[PDB]
Amino acid sequence: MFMINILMLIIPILLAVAFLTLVERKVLGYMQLRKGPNVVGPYGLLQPIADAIKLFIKEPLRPATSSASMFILAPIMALGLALTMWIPLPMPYPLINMNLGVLFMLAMSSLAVYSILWSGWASNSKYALIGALRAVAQTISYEVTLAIILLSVLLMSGSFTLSTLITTQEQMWLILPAWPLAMMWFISTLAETNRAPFDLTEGESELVSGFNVEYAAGPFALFFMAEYANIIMMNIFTAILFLGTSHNPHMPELYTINFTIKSLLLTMSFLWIRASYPRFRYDQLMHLLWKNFLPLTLALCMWHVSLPILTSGIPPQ
């Protein structure tokens, strides 16, 4: 019954991306002083099952001046790596016990930009031709802001597995000994996964130009779908790394209860940022990576090399 476990993980998470689109706007609504989806629910709660069927009735045109084998291959690789990344992730037991899987996250988070380079090219001209070339350019630069300060906690964890990442945090909630790194951990995933303040990707992006600009609601229904699957997955990855919960072997039930409550709270912030701050005007977006983000990340890197040595506090492996 291994095969019944995989389907027990793909299917209960497509609701949690469909029941996030509804909480996308109720939370964003009470900031504007207005109620949620009022009339169809009764409380809203039945909105996405009606808002899903309309997309698969509405005619999925292909553009006449488009290519063929590239345009319908990027949504295959969209949902592939958006759902494959959920595998090696402990809660409290992962589906797969990888020896080194923290690196496998970057082995999965690297290839997502190789679909945007397809879809911007595969269909058509200037509103996604050059306008998607400068969306690959922002997402490549925020790995070296990411991969360094992901390594900067592993000097304190001890190894590459994720079971040690819960063992080392039984008494600490490790956001305290590394709180400068925890800041730039947030803004990276806030800009890499193509969200609201650093937003030259989706729809705020000259407010007209996106990679969604050409997909009718047949193939478009996944792009949005798949994408919303990253944003609840960097949140499930931050809260297993910094803000780690407590594991008890005799009681694994109380792990997940105290766990899903925490990833939901960080997921609120991606909604709660969008209702405050304006955009970044593509220069100043990348003007603060090199000049401003990056030299501090090397500074704390040299700090986290020497401090396990000159404390005589080497982590065991």
Ligand X SMILES: CCCCCCCCCCCCCCCCCC(=O)OC[C@H](COP(=O)(O)OCCN)OC(=O)CCCCCCCCCCCCCCCCC
> 92: cis peptide before it, omega within 30°?
yes
Residue 99 interacts with, from ligand X, another protein, none (CB under 5-8 Å by kind)? ligand X
Residue 221 interacts with, from another protein, ligand X, none (CB under 5-8 Å by kind)? another protein
By residue count, the chain amounts to 317
Nearest residue to ligand X by CB is 99
Encoded tokens for 203? 């729809």
Residues 191-220 that bind ligand X (CB under 6 A): 197
Residue 250 vs 291, nearer CB to another protein: 291
> Which has the closest alpha carbon to 131: 64, 71, 55, 203?
203
Segment contacting ligand X by CB under 6 A, of 42-50, 92-100, 118-126, 209-217: 92-100
Q: What is the four-CA torsion angle of 301, 307, 309, 312, rounded to 10 degrees?
A: -150
Q: CB of 218: closest distance to another protein in angstroms?
A: 5
Verify binding: residue 6, ligand X, rule CB under 6 A.
no
Give the residue, chosen from 8, 15, 111, 133, that forms a contact with another protein under the rule CB under 8 A.
Answer: 133
| Per-residue contact flags (x/-) with another protein for residues 173 to 202, judged by CB under 8 A | ------------------------x-x---
Q: Is 4 exposed, middle or buried (0-12, 13-18, 19+ CB in 10 A)?
A: exposed
Q: What is the four-CA torsion angle of 154, 156, 160, 162, rounded to 10 degrees?
A: -110
Verify binding: residue 173, ligand X, rule CB under 6 A.
no
User: In the chain, what are the helix, strand and coil shares in percent, each to the nearest 5?
Assistant: 50, 0, 50
**Gap between the Cα atoms of 198 and 12, Å rounded:** 30
Verify binding: residue 101, another protein, rule CB under 8 A.
no
Verify binding: residue 305, another protein, rule CB under 8 A.
yes
Q: CB of 186: closest distance to ligand X in angstroms?
A: 4
Verify binding: residue 296, ligand X, rule CB under 6 A.
yes
> Which has the closest alpha carbon to 169: 236, 98, 252, 246?
246
Verify binding: residue 3, another protein, rule CB under 8 A.
yes
Verify binding: residue 277, ligand X, rule CB under 6 A.
yes
Verify binding: residue 62, another protein, rule CB under 8 A.
yes
Verify binding: residue 258, ligand X, rule CB under 6 A.
no
> Which has the closest alpha carbon to 147: 314, 2, 294?
294
The residues of the shown chain that bind ligand X, judged by CB under 6 A, are 76, 98-100, 180, 183-184, 186-187, 197, 273, 277, 288, 292, 296
